[model samples]
Target: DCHLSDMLQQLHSVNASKPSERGLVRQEEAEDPACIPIFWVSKWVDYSDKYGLGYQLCDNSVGVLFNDSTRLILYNDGDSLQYIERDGTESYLTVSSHPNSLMKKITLLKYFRNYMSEHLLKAGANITPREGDELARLPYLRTWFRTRSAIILHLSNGSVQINFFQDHTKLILCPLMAAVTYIDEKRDFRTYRLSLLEEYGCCKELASRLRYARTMVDKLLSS
Candidate 1:
């Protein structure tokens, strides 16, 4: 099992310096318009023990520090996503299971359709299904809309991290890196050492959604 205390220690170290001392480090530019924060938590379920199967958790957080300093934090438990602004007030985005049946699995497409439509409407932009389809054809916008089982954490920095969890076990770290790359491609912090998750074909739906979402983001950027 993962220990919560260990994770907190790791997190503390990553955010060690005060905001004033540390600047926004540009490791690489993103293909998209915004810089995204990426963090991953891994847990393994093992039935080897006689007492019944239990989960063993191992977690890590990844981010680029100012001045090309790449920082990674590892711990057993206790993970959080916080937007720590320069003034020090934190507005956290809560992560939890999808609340309704309509928001789960195959139903996510419809959920997003409605969700994005409402926002577009509020912005005084009316989008019909045909318009949405046309919008989805654009690479970035398509990718943003097609992602499934995604969690968006709005940070105090006015930037957000959108995590696409393929499963409880694994997350795609590249998206976060890609977001960074979109902003400043000249930075040298380009490579990532990501942990591999167990392969399962049952996850195809979720995977497809992520691909679509990415395409949407790309399209959005272009437009």
Candidate 2:
């Protein structure tokens, strides 16, 4: 199944319908825990100059958005692999079936996987995949940037995650779903509907971060 493609499809639908009226977050989702999407920034390695960015999701899937503008994922503990093109074409492969053309990429992916597992402290979040869901279907990181303030990641699901190094807190915004989630330094997750900003104000920390997100995104597009 092309989970990545399906996720993007939903975003297009949501983004297209009633752009003006959609600004408010729904109250129902504010109080509903089940509506909160599950994604954890487990670990990341920036070898972008040479290889690309490597990251691990909470579901234990490791992926590399390669320098060639393609992506390679290793899941099932290195038993299975998924290759994704810049245009979103995907093909599944196994360790034994990997082609010679991809051998170097596979080697680097393995090194990244091993390095993260051995050196990095697993991000403190227990959000697990629901039943009937396979870890392989998790959304992979699409693009990202790091600044003095934080590292921002844009995932395949149209979710933007900003992780602040100063406080170790993180914010995730899902424009398609109109949901806002915050992860405190302890990694406790609190989710709300986007309307929360209008119906009531958020904390100062959240406010500043939200402003920063806007500024960063605006600057990103202009430059």
Candidate 3:
């Protein structure tokens, strides 16, 4: 091959090795979550009514869920997505024939996976699992962190807030830092708040994934 031809060949090879960035995003997005537009189901009401502190709300509706879809973190991964329906009242996503809007929404499942895999990397990377406690008070989750040393504490269902503390065991309103979450969903949902343990190296690498989550979130509101 000529010099120019050889250079182009190398470029192609390098890119191919990398995979298409979007497609590359797929595997990373596999388990990580991305936003969903707030859609309603009667369940949230029942959930709040039956249990304890409900989600951040506006009037009766869960205001956060109603916000820009991009702010909602979705955790479904499927080529066909829930290709089955367990009951008559199920969402029509799997109906033999689907609505165009709903169909497009399902496709967001894929986009979210991609967005998270690509953009949510910083927070997603530093996670280290630990045993958390479940609140006896509520039927639902409540994993509160023990130490206030956490740069940020984010419960998936919980609002994105991190309570930073002072060295003297006094409280301070410090906000925003690195990202981290464990794959142990049950532990996190029912029992744990993975935070503030100095051993995990909260130095920049720890917040690796946390900041990116906000980054994507900011992108949604700013634009």
Which candidate gets the maximum lDDT versus the true structure?
Answer: 2
lDDT to native, each model: 0.24, 0.70, 0.25
TM-score, candidate 1, is: 0.18
| TM-score for each model | 0.18, 0.79, 0.24
Model 2, span 86-177: residue lDDT tens: 89898888778868988999999999999999998766456766765563356777778999989988787666778898888887766656
Candidate No. with top TM-score: 2
* TM-score quality measure for candidate 2: 0.79
Q: What clash count goes with each model?
A: 33, 1, 15
lDDT of 3 by residue, 1-223 (tens): 1322332333233233432333222222312222211111111211222221212211112111111222221222222222212221223233234556455544443343444345432221222323332211111111222233433222223333332233211111111111122222122211111222222222222133234333433332343
Sorted on TM-score, highest at the top, how do the candidates line up? 2, 3, 1
Model 1, 73-162: lDDT tens digits are 111122222222334343333123333421222132233233333442221011112322322211100111213554432221222223
lDDT, residue 185, candidate 3: 17
Clashing pairs in 2: 25-195
- What's the distance in Å from true for residue 223, model 2? 7.2
Query: lDDT at 9 for candidate 1?
Result: 30
